[PDB]
Symmetry: D2
Subunit: 425 residues, 4 copies
């Protein structure tokens, strides 16, 4: 029904193995990736990637999140970067085949015992300019996150807080930090200086695993393709690092000086895209999903229950995609936490949410703009078909394919409770 | 609550190993769940009175077996009439009415190589009188099943064929027999004579396991509580046998002499009910579900996909029940095959499907008698409410409990594709 | 199949069809059940020991000789019936029947003698009659005591005190027959040498439909502890009057073995039944089948995960030896034991290889029947001047009795477990040997 | 305090996800570094004084790249390495043997090139222990190298370098006839897409681990350390992941041969390896290796599993094995024990060659045989306990597993013994 050639692609013989050792032995270099690249790419916006024309090329190469490093440059400079990014993103708003929303992240300068005076001004700037994510520098304890949450005035409560663990104190207080944070960033640059360089990989692997268990996005950062600042190709250690960060379970991967000041910014985005696609295919979903399932506590939350039921169903039929109607992005995040092999096409009316779901691995946002139907059930079905139309368009779906549709019983966020098995018409 | 997690061997079912599970079995941990394993009671002079049968229904008789090896067609027609009169004596309360299937156990081929002439007449009688299940005696190969299917004719298309494996040939050709049969019966009486008595348990355990893997109902039969033919209580070996048949994975357990001619017909049914309730609580669902999940093949069938997703969701929230609408009973059978701990409350308008689902373990049928609503979605919701009301009335459900609702996208059999997480109001 | 492709070519495809070997190689328990073949015959010797109650139907020296041949390992004397004089004659008839095969020490089968106490009855502890019966057992050299109605750890202490200083070697198997005993099980097992699941009284004290949970829990806890457990009462009840048992009785016996019972017992089936030798033969047949169908893959891995880390050389050598035995499909594990402890420590890991235990102690040789898979050999030769030579002569005695009784054939691999110095407690050496 | 060190809370976890969550940066490694370090000998690491520092930093195998330099040049490198290694021979309980590996030029456009035959003959004449065969494509290429060593080069180990697509495809036939494999990522990253190299590395390492043969991870492991004193976050990650994958050896190419920091790179690889080995999830690893290993009727193979199982039960400090060829130690290594495999051998070539196996710590026994064989065996077991105690592997009170045979000569290993230290 699917074919012998289908079961050779995207490391399907390796993922069917009864053991992890057998899985490794079945990894085929001739087994090509079919699924879209799920791990998002954070690109640092600097002089080498600041023109509306250069930004248009980086969006095409695969940039999902645009990072503004507030350690360098004025508020006036970063406001122009925000405008150039928004102008480059809206240049494809006519065509829904090239239109992809891009999140804007503010990376704070850093602390001093707590939130610095400059950081309060920078955070206030981010709120006034509508940033989606905040990369809080040098988070040490839960009170540091609370300080950043407080500095995000009456307005900025929707902004996501990704705590950067860059020192020994934060590594030790990790559990309390993650509890109050929206996600974590393994800031390996400063971490490699505060703690022994040979212990950084344990912190990365521990934090990624704990984030995966918690269901919160984790970013792997610093020197991923460092040689790409001056060279067109990365070293064997750099491609290995990127691939292993994806394998560890990182939701996002990041380019710092490779995109901000490097001679090769578009090339680095293209390279990260290529390695991520390969690595995701080699993920051992059999053990991953069973462990995530066993480790996850029992839940009486319909969204959480529908999320595991949907991912279970998606694996059973090899669903092409899981279409989820979300408003805040929560439902899509809860699907992503179980690491499905099917792309989570998330249809939202919230432009902020559509940008913010790039933080979650495997979530492909669609901003649906249409005017609402008088009947709610009809409005839900127009958003579902919109999911299918775009899926068909961007290569995810073909007629005959199976998809899992996740919706709620009534309007408003938090009522997700339905999972539907749908055949593409 | 604390008290909830002490009942129905919940500490034992949470164990990381099967050895730990056994060590955590508490005799003071009472069963809460309803008895899922159905009870087949052989009809005889000890069980023909309408008043007596009413007591047997109350004790838990689900299937009434008519042994065609004894008695005339006239005799069995009076049996059918007494079973039906006794079952219909509780039709006045449709939320607490228990349907009872009627199974015809053929005389057999005897000396003959295939379907005997008497068997053709008996099968035609079964069809004319509306039997639900046929227990084909001495099935030796797949052609024997085909012969019985042919003898039922076009009017007996709906009747289920449970092949009785009673000899060595039938044990060897098991795979071909099970392939063409609706289910199997481990006929231990004749099997204990055809094969060495000390090898019968291996045939029982093999057949039960293979049936469980296939998703087809399996019946454990003969001498389960033999001493109760004359004595008020069974031996320590008999209670152990019944409990182990349930633990092995038998969908149904059966009483022959115990209910046909014995002095304790009602008490035998009460005893089997009691042991089954205890055994089901002690089932190690942690390993059972994970093995059944792993062993099941990939499917592109929406009913099959929704079934595994629903059972997975039911386990995540400790669902009180899974309410499924079904025409043929297939949807309920597909939920049953994954051995959920939640009761599969199956609502159906088909009286034959409601009787036949007793073959599947954990399926509690409800016959919906109301005439259809003009709007199909309203008619579906009225049947879901009928299920919640009967569930609440019979003690399956309490307000605050979570329930998984399984429905389809259009009327008619084959279209189940929706799973819904619902909280009892 | 790559993890058996080489050994299937060597040992053969016919070897890997017998004793439910395709079923035991399955990756899941569900797959194991699907691979159970009725045409797969048992090759190994019957490991689960058979306790037979000695009564009028099984008292003559000639009848006892037939029951030993049929497979009786332990002879139970029920002190709830009969006088001390009566039980002394039973002891004499059993000993006479056992010693009638002493002429061939490579094919002589030792039989343990167990005393089943009358019980406390109305009383709160050890009855006055029980004290007299226990002193009788000590005076007559019984190997095991089946303490009736044990309810707390103080009850077993009372029985150990009543045996006195002369009855220190006797094993105490506590019978759990009531709700109190089931609840205080952990404290009872801690101070007892083993347990007996007395299902007759247990089926009366607790609901009959709850007895199987108590049996399965107690057996599992005993298996975890490494102590012998006995399944008792109504196992083949219909054979008291009938030549063949019911489908429920064969099922019960097979399931008790599967649960992990070290011993199975015949009460009124042999004491007063019309077919006492037939019941022993039947229990032997069902046990051999059931042991083959044991899912050793998960059983051994669970027993290893559940067992705590040990710094005891005997305990360490025991797990290392059982692991080695499984790697090469060892025909047997030959262990030199004084008290039986080393053989008990091998048994707790439930090896598929037969634990052939060579001991000079006649009481230990009788008492190791309590452990499943231990086949005792009583070494009667006088010691060699060199200890290493004396050890090698006992190892050869084991290989010769193993070859003679069919356990071993030339080409088979065996695991030899010995110590570094004489005396009990010094087991620390494991040796892989090929049968010559 | 013992159960907090060397990631013991993480290794006790019931799941691999839980294992990752329990990784503690404050949990220090106690055990010795098992993964061997191959250092490429070049101009930056040629002096006897510089080599002595690299031996102290952790070098176990010295690689001679025959793609550059004359036979005269490589003979001087061999002499300088041997002089630096023998400078610590005065203390035989704390002397570290170093293997010498010859990395062939390759076939290039061509089977076995004419230069390769001359280079292989040179290695035989100079007593090399290992040969890193460049660009192996099929089983006949390995046979060609074995033929070129001749009758004098039987003892030399052949590590086939998989550097192209053909070699990756015919991997099963190559590994079957080779002594081990080297994942040559430099050329492999050019022949196949760079983003597919990690799949080849992970596949080859897993297949080698299954086979029980040594595997080497090679090229650009700490590349930035050629010009900088510290590596990038990607490079430390790469090294740690190669160890985690199951590589028996890790290699420094231009980082030791021509880099400004050759001793620093050896020190860095040692540090990352020690940390990574502690974070290995032995619970699942040993159970998977046990399940995956076929049944064997070979006493050495059987005693090897039995000994590793016993070592895990008592948390044995070390497994002392008496070996002649190194085979018994290799068979213990394949089950990846947490206990150090202290291997006592009289053969100097075997003692150098066991660096190819992860977790095998060679000891060269330099005393002449006792008249009684049992006494000679006990003296070698004591030599192992004394060197263990001396080098910090053992403390009084620790438990050790001793693996010996029933008679002298190779292939008769069949005994396992539980021993308590002093
Ligand atoms: O390998 S085992 O025999 C075993 C038995 C049962 C199960 C678990 N069931 C199970 C798991 C998956 C299935 O597909 C299935 O049909 C049954 S169970 O809990 O359902 C069960 C419980 C009780 C039984 O009598 C029985 O036969 C089975 C696993 C391993 C074993 C292993 C370890 C022990 O300590 C020990 O006493 C026995
Ligand atoms: O992921 P979220 O934010 O909780 O949103 C889930 C909600 O979105 C829906 O799927 C769509 O409903 P809306 O029409 O209100 O967007 C709801 O039925 C459900 O309550
Ligand atoms: O299990 P079956 O036989 O497929 O019946 C399930 C069917 O019942 C329904 O749930 C309800 O349909 P009906 O209105 O015909 O009763 C269908 O949507 C579904 O196809
Ligand atoms: O099982 P036990 O009672 O500990 O006996 C094991 C003992 O038996 C031996 O193997 C042989 O002992 P003996 O020389 O005393 O007969 C000892 O080396 C070891 O200490
Ligand atoms: O690892 P190898 O080469 O098989 O060597 C193992 C051999 O070493 C020993 O342990 C000691 O052997 P030697 O007396 O030859 O040194 C033997 O008993 C065994 O045969
Ligand atoms: O700021 C950062 O991201 C760092 O230091 O790694
Ligand atoms: O007919 C039966 O039920 C049998 O043979 O078991
Ligand atoms: O005494 C017994 O054996 C019993 O009660 O079962
Ligand atoms: O020769 C090598 O090692 C390479 O090319 O990687
Ligand atoms: K910054
Ligand atoms: K019949
Ligand atoms: K008694
Ligand atoms: K070269
Ligand atoms: Mg920083
Ligand atoms: Mg019959
Ligand atoms: Mg009693
Ligand atoms: Mg090369």
């Amino acid at each position: 029904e699917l074919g012998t050639a289908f079961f050779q692609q995207q490391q399907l013989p390796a993922a069917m193995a009864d053991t992890f050792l057998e899985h490794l032995c079945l990894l085929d270099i001739d087994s090509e990736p079919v699924a879209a690249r799920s791990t998002s790419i954070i690109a640092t916006i600097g002089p080498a990637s600041r023109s509306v024309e250069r930004l248009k090329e980086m969006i095409k190469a695969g940039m999902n999140i645009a990072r503004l490093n507030f350690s360098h440059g004025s508020h006036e400079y970063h406001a122009e970067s925000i405008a150039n990014v928004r102008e480059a993103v809206e240049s494809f708003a006519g065509s829904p085949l090239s239109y992809r929303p891009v999140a804007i992240a503010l990376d704070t300068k850093g602390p001093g015992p707590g939130l610095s005076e400059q950081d309060v001004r920078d955070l206030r700037f981010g709120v006034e300019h509508g940033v989606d994510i905040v990369f809080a520098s040098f988070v040490r304890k839960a009170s540091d996150v609370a300080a950043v949450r407080a500095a995000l005035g009456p307005e900025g409560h929707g902004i996501k807080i990704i705590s950067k663990i860059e020192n020994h104190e934060g590594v030790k207080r990790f559990d309390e930090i993650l509890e109050v944070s929206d996600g974590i960033m393994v800031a390996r640059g400063d971490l490699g200086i505060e703690i022994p360089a040979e212990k950084v990989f344990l912190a990365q692997k521990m934090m990624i695993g704990r984030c995966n268990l918690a269901g919160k996005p984790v970013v792997c950062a610093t020197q991923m393709l460092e040689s790409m600042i001056t060279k067109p190709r990365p070293t064997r250690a750099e491609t290995s690092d990127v691939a292993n960060a994806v394998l560890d379970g990182a939701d996002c991967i990041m380019l710092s000086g490779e995109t901000a000041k490097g001679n090769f910014p578009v090339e680095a985005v293209k390279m990260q895209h290529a390695i991520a696609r390969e690595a995701e295919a080699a993920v051992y979903h059999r053990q991953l999903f069973e462990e995530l399932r066993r480790a996850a506590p029992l839940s009486r939350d319909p969204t959480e229950v529908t999320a595991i039921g949907a991912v279970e169903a998606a694996f059973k039929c090899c669903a092409a995609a899981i279409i989820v109607l979300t408003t805040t992005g929560r439902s899509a995040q809860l699907l992503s936490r179980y690491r499905p092999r099917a792309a989570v096409i998330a249809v939202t009316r919230s432009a902020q949410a559509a940008r913010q779901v790039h933080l979650c691995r495997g979530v492909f946002p669609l901003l649906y703009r249409e005017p609402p139907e008088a009947i709610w059930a009809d409005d839900v079905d127009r958003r579902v078909q919109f999911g299918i139309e775009s899926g068909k368009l961007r290569g995810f779906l073909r007629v005959g394919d199976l998809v899992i549709v996740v919706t709620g019983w009534r309007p408003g966020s938090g009522y997700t409770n339905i999972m539907r098995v749908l055949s593409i018409s």
